[PDB]
């Protein structure tokens, strides 16, 4: 699998950005640049002014003053709009959940790598030092096997030095978990808000049908005021959806560039590109460190086996500690296999692709469908309102 | 993440399976059992008889012979039903797509493992034999360096022997790809069929509104016949959804058991359990063979480097051969890191959990919502039909 820009993303990237004072700005995704927020704020103003133009248009129609066919058409358009809105809200929720799961999996992988490195270095320092110190006086009589103890100690120091070269993912873990919590809050509130909007739209459609059903004038004022409120709400929803869609498409155009120049200080660019691209040829930055770790572990097991074969027949007083060393080395080699499984680019690359498909493919499609909902609902309510003057003639 | 049985799965596991002759049959998921298949067939007959009872009920009502309120209620129930049906169809499609993606990624991982093993063994046999045979005559003047060549040859033999011990996933690739193609065909056809059913139901609702609108009797016969056809179709859909939901729940209760006795001959049980459970404490079955491979590779590079340090300054007859050996061994260690990354239980365990969540969590929920669609549409059309005798009074 690989990431290619879909047609909707590249087309929405072409939307011009002019900002508040209508000047060309750098189109590239860059939150925190005061020009960028103004450019996104301009798109909201376009819909806000479009609401003002629409509000005057419908009011003037009520001032300048087959009707059942227009009412039925308005109801049909409202039902189609709310159906499309339900579909779009579900799709946006799916995209946000995909992003949440991808971030959770990346957080778990980084936590696993960090825990493996920390546990391995802590064990190889503390427990190995303790056991060697305990067995040193036993081997103090014999100078050989005691040179070998120093050899093991120095190569354990080499292992710790090599392991310390691996990047620390403590900050990345915190960033990922806090951003996941933030997106959880935002997604829950947004989904609840759109569900409430859909329910209110359906209730207003039912009241609109009841108004002609019961021929009550007092209900007409309530439905009209609620329709105006829902109209302004739907125009605000259209503005928000347009801004969010253009921002998401702009980010989706250059996700690699964005991640490269956000995670530039905390994470080295070498491993950043390694995980972002996951080249199949090789050149993994961890290959040399893992090779050194595995070579050192293998030779340590060789010397410990030599101790077990020869020293135990002579110095059998306390050799269960050598068995403990063997347990330690076997567990450390299992941890080595786990570590080289985690640090591969395959899993994190799959998570990153899943996140992109969540926001670029499903999230953007859902946002576009929600914008279509907003526009269709606005048109339907405007048509219902302008048909009102001859609707209340009874 | 871990798999726990949801409430709907365990509740649907308690549906009584009695077969054709109403004899208690085992509830364990076994599509190859003739009795079990009859139990699913019995569930379809329950709805089929329920269709017969419903058909007589509505026919008798037309024989024994506010109406606009009943018609409006029927239309509202129809609209709600088709909305729920759209939601359920989308959810089932999402679940099937999740299953497709999990199977595809598992296929890719198995293909990667197989390709890595095959390439490594083919290279370590053919290229080692060729290069050593080419450089043997050069080293013919010294029995030393030839003892080393023989040692390298025997260790390459050990490497290929250890690598041959890894399981062959050729059959598993066939099974996964053919099942993915089959589920693609089935899901495409099923989604198209339900989309067509929803569209026809909406068209019939529109025609129902038009018939009362235009007061045309000739349209009433067409809407009644189409309603009867859609009624029998919806009852068949309910039968299919109930049977499929029961089968999926039966599988989802014991997925581990099902996979254990479906994949029993082609794949050994220990690795199947390792990939199904992915225990962090339990030693991986590939740990010993990967350790042997890495030890042999490191020692081989040790002898090759020793040769480069001593044979090259003295002989210098051919160095590109040893340089090619070093390229080969570096590439083989990169392949080793890739192999130990792929064979970890983490990736395939995540794939299996994703597939389970696709069919157990999303697929079954979508199927239940489609069954709700079928029942609601049947009730709505029955109510519309029984209101017809006083509807056509004009
Ligand atoms: C992201 O991973 C970190 C681990 O680095 C998780 O932090 C742990 O969270 C659990 C549950 O809250 C605590 O019991 C641990 O003490 C935490 N460990 C550390 C080192 O802080 C974190 O919960 C994960 N976040 C998400 C959203 O999955
Ligand atoms: C650590 O693992 C090694 C490798 O398995 C153990 O070495 C023994 O190897 C022989 C032949 O491969 C077999 O008897 C067993 O695989 C191992 N012995 C036992 C008793 O399991 C080594 O023993 C392990 N460490 C300890 C303390 O047992
Ligand atoms: C499952 O993996 C196998 C590889 O083991 C894929 O088979 C290859 O497909 C490509 C694409 O046409 C062919 O060029 C190769 O010749 C195939 N190899 C073999 C050995 O048949 C298969 O396409 C994969 N299926 C899915 C659905 O991903
Ligand atoms: C295969 O990889 C090894 C390990 O990197 C190469 O050995 C050299 O190691 C030293 C110290 O780490 C460095 O100069 C380079 O990493 C390696 N040398 C070169 C010239 O790259 C070994 O050279 C590699 N094989 C070949 C044929 O270059
Ligand atoms: C934004 O600025 C960067 C660097 O100055 C430049 O490479 C890029 O072309 C600019 N893009 C636009 C749309 O101005
Ligand atoms: C990241 O943003 C900075 C800030 O303007 C910019 O200078 C840099 O070029 C960007 N990174 C890339 C790869 O363009
Ligand atoms: C099915 O058979 C197995 C083995 O005979 C048994 O353990 C299980 O309880 C049976 N299931 C039912 C529902 O009787
Ligand atoms: C698989 O099916 C056989 C035959 O019915 C049964 O004996 C066995 O118990 C099943 N597998 C498991 C793990 O129970």
From Swiss-Prot, chains A, B:
Q: In which tissues is it expressed?
A: Expressed at higher level in brain and testis and at lower levels in heart, ovary, spleen and peripheral blood leukocytes. Up-regulated in 13 of 16 renal cell carcinoma samples examined. Up-regulated in colon carcinoma.
| Feature type site, description Essential for the formation of the channel-pore | 142
Q: Topologically, how does it sit relative to the membrane?
A: Multi-pass membrane protein
Which one of the record's GO molecular function terms can you name?
intracellularly calcium-gated chloride channel activity
Its post-translational modification remark reads: N- Glycosylated. Contains high-mannose, hybrid and complex oligosaccharides.
- Consequence of mutating residue 26 to Q? Loss of glycosylation. No effect on cell membrane localization, increased ubiquitination and significant decrease in protein levels
Example of a GO biological process term: L-glutamate transmembrane transport
Instruction: Tell me which domain of life the UniProt entry assigns to the organism this sequence originates from.
Output: Eukaryota
Give the UniProt keywords, A-Z.
Calcium, Cell membrane, Chloride, Chloride channel, Disulfide bond, Glycoprotein, Ion channel, Ion transport, Membrane, Metal-binding, Phosphoprotein, Transmembrane, Transmembrane helix, Transport, Ubl conjugation
The reaction(s) this protein catalyses: chloride(in) = chloride(out); L-glutamate(out) = L-glutamate(in)
State the GO CC annotations.
Answer: chloride channel complex; plasma membrane
Q: List S-S links within the chain.
A: 252-360, 278-345
Membrane spanning segments where? 40-60, 66-86, 192-212, 219-239, 367-387
Describe the protein's quaternary organization and the partners it interacts with. Homodimer. Forms cis-homodimers in the presence of Ca(+2) and forms monomers and trans-dimers in the absence of Ca(2+). Interacts with NEDD4L.
General function of this protein? Calcium-independent, swelling-dependent volume-regulated anion channel (VRAC-swell) which plays a pivotal role in the process of regulatory volume decrease (RVD) in the brain through the efflux of anions like chloride and organic osmolytes like glutamate. Probable large-conductance Ca(2+)-activated chloride channel.
Protein name (Swiss-Prot/TrEMBL): Protein tweety homolog 2
Q: Which organism is it from?
A: Homo sapiens
Q: What is the lineage of its organism?
A: Eukaryota, Metazoa, Chordata, Craniata, Vertebrata
* Encoding gene per record: TTYH2
**What range of the parent protein does this fragment cover?**
6 to 416 of 534
């Amino acid at each position: 699998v690989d990431y290619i820009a879909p047609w909707w993303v590249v087309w929405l990237h072409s939307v011009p950005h002019v900002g508040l004072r209508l000047q060309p700005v750098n189109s590239t995704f860059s939150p925190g640049d005061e020009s960028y927020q103004e450019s996104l704020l301009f798109l909201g103003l376009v819909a806000a002014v479009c609401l003002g133009l629409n509000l005057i248009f419908l009011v003037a129609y009520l001032v300048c003053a087959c009707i059942t066919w227009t009412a039925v058409v308005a109801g049909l358009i409202c039902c189609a709009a709310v159906g499309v809105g339900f579909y779009g809200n579900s799709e946006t929720n799916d995209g946000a959940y995909q992003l949440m799961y991808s971030l959770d999996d990346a957080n778990h992988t980084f936590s696993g790598i960090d825990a493996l490195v920390s546990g391995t270095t802590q064990k190889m320092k503390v427990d190995l030092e303790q056991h060697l110190a305990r067995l040193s006086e036993i081997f103090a009589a014999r100078g050989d096997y005691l040179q070998t103890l120093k050899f093991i100690q120095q190569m354990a120091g080499s292992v710790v030095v090599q392991l310390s070269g691996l990047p620390v993912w403590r900050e990345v873990t915190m960033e990922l978990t806090k951003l996941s919590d933030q997106t959880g809050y935002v997604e829950y509130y947004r989904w609840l808000s759109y569900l409430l909007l859909f329910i209110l739209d359906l209730v207003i459609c039912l009241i609109a049908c009841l108004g002609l059903a019961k021929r009550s004038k007092c209900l007409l004022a309530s439905m009209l005021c609620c329709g105006a409120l829902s109209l302004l709400l739907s125009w605000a929803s259209l503005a928000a959806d347009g801004s969010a869609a253009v921002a998401t498409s702009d980010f989706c155009v250059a996700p690699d560039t964005f991640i490269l120049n956000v995670t530039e200080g905390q994470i080295s660019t070498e491993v950043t590109r390694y995980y972002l691209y996951c080249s199949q040829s090789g050149s993994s930055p961890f290959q040399q460190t893992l090779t050194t770790f595995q070579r050192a572990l293998t030779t340590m097991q060789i010397q410990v086996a030599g101790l077990l074969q020869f020293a135990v027949p002579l110095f059998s007083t306390a050799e269960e500690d050598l068995l403990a060393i063997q347990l330690l080395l076997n567990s450390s080699e299992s941890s080595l296999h786990q570590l080289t499984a985690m640090v591969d680019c395959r899993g994190l690359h799959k998570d990153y692709l899943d996140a992109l498909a969540g926001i670029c493919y499903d999230g953007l499609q859902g946002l576009l469908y929600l914008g279509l909902f907003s526009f269709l609902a606005a048109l339907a309510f405007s048509t219902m309102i302008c048909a009102g003057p001859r609707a209340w003639k009874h």
